Structure formats: C-alpha cells, structure tokens
Amino acid sequence: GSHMLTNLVAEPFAKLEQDFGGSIGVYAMDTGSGATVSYRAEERFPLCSSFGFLAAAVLARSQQQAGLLDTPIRYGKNALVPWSPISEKYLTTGMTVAELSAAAVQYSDNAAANLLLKELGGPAGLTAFMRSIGDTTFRLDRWELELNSAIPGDARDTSSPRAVTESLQKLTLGSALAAPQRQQFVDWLKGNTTGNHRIRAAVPADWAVGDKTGTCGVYGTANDYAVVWPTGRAPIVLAVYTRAPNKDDKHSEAVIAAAARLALEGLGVNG
Ligand SMILES: CC(C)(C)OC(=O)N[C@@]1(C(=O)Nc2nnn[nH]2)CN(C(=O)c2cccc(C(F)(F)F)c2)c2ccccc21
C-alpha cells in the first residue's frame, strides 16, 4: 500500500524511458485524494527554462512593495540575449515588470528572465525565495543562457520533480502567495504558448491547464510542470523532467506527453 499507485506504473515508466534512451522523472499529486505517483521524483534534473518560479518570486515581492508590477523597465541592446521574442519588440520602449514576467512565463523570453533575475538579486535571490516557501531542493546558480548546459552529474540549476510539484502546489493552490497574486500566477501559466505538445497534449480538451516548459537544447533535457483542472474535480499538480547521457541526444516532447499520461493513468484519471 501507500506506494501502490507508484508501483502500478513503475514498469510502463521504465519502458518509456528505455525507448527514450535516457531518464524520466515524474511526480504527480491528486489534490483531492492526496494520491501521488512517483518515478525518479527525488532525482535532480536540469530546470532549463522551467525556472515560472521566477514570476512567482516577483509576485511575492510585489506584496511587500506597492506598484512593483507596474514599474517600467528600460533596457539596452546588450541586455538582449538569444530567443527573446517579446522583449526585443519593446527594446525602444521598455516594458513593465508584469509584462516581463508574462513574457518569461508564456514565451520563455530570455532577456525578460535575466532582467527579472537582477531585480530579485540574481539566481541566489530566486533560490532564497524558494527556501522561504519550504523548497530545500531547488537551486538556481547561473543566468540565461549558461544555466542550460545540463551537464551529467551537475547539480547546478536543478531541482527534483517532487520539489517542483510541491512548490507549484504551494504557489498556485496553497497560501505561499496572497490571493490576488496566486490568481495572477495561475493566469500567467494558463496563457503559456510553449507547452502545447507536452502536458497539454496529455489531458482532455475541456481541462483547464497552466504550465511552464523547459528545454535546455542538449543532453535530451526538456521538461514541463503544470496544474490541470479536471472539469468539476479537484486539480492535479505534476512535473515531468527528462535528461539523457549524450550531449547530442535529442529531447522528445512526445515522451513528456506520454509520461504525463502515465502519471494521470496511475492517479486514477484518464490519460
Ligand atoms: C525555437 C527553439 C526550439 C529553439 O526554442 C527556443 O526558441 N529557445 C529555447 C526555448 O524555447 N525555451 C523553452 N523551450 N521550452 N521551454 N522553454 C529552446 N532552447 C533550446 O536550446 C533548444 C530548443 C529546441 C531544440 C534544440 C536543439 F536543436 F538544440 F535540440 C534546442 C533554449 C535554450 C536555452 C534558452 C531558451 C531556449
């Protein structure tokens, strides 16, 4: 018992990560049942772009400092880093802190994320925020885009699927954020545009989904974490993280979607 759901899907998960050629880490909790499914859920995986939590940290700080979200941020061309499809459209005008947050969550805007990182004190500030809500696993160490190196055995810029899921639940469903900020965090995740082929591809069409993706681009390392609401039922929080032994190994969005389905199938809902 207790771990019965985990062992329900243990063999299919191992088969899926064998076909993938790497490791798959999954954690998922049914916030109604308390039921959990675990597969490599306590192992470290590169966060890549999934380091969503930056936007939550910004929302938490805005509770202490009035007008933070509306503050305009002006930046030069040197602040632009590759793959900033939003912030490069506003180089000559600037953006507000909330707009930088929405761009970081919904488009993985790299220049927006680095600007918000400096606002909070760098990677140590974001790590400090995660400690304040009880996450002792998360660590951010570098900036975009150095945090994507995803080196085997390197604990820098990693966390675990379980801690990610536990942190996501405190921020979206618990009381780590005040009620207006919690709903705002939820709204930013709901409007994400990069996760259509991952967790979203694994849920029924009528489910509401908020997610944040990550893609390091090397070592077959990609991920996705989400809160999903079955129609009329308690929400589910889940995190799917992958990695692979070789730098040239390619990630698979299908593998992430397939792992999310297995986790949902183990919990008791249809995947
Ligand atoms: C369009 C493209 C697919 C290039 O993605 C990006 O535009 N930029 C990234 C991204 O979307 N971030 C993300 N994605 N999901 N969530 N956040 C994606 N990326 C990659 O290195 C990447 C993505 C796909 C394939 C490859 C490969 F050919 F090398 F394998 C590398 C990256 C790295 C660091 C920072 C940001 C990114």
77: number of Cβ within 10 Å: 9
Q: What is the resolution of this structure in A?
A: 2.2
Closest by CA to 271, choosing from 218, 201, 203, 200, is: 203
The ligand 1 site (C-beta within 6 Å) comprises 49, 83, 108, 110, 144-145, 148, 194, 213-217, 250
Instruction: Report the run of H or E that residue 72 belongs to, with start and end.
Output: strand 72-73
- Angle, nearest 10°, between helix axes 179-190 and 161-172? 120
What is the set of domains in the chain, with CATH numbers? 3-267 (3.40.710.10)
Which residue ranges are tagged as binding site for a beta-lactam?
Answer: 49, 83, 108, 110, 213, 215
- Angle, nearest 10°, between helix axes 123-132 and 110-120? 70
Residues 69 and 96 sit within 8 Å (Cβ to Cβ)? yes
Which residue ranges are tagged as binding site?
Answer: 49, 83, 108, 110, 213, 215
Is the Cα torsion angle 167, 241, 105, 271 positive or negative in sign?
negative
Name the residue with the closest Cα to ligand 1, atom 37: 215
Residues 52 and 105 sit within 8 Å (Cβ to Cβ)? yes
Which residues does the annotation mark as catalytic? Answer: 49, 146
Residues 245 and 255 sit within 8 Å (Cβ to Cβ)? no
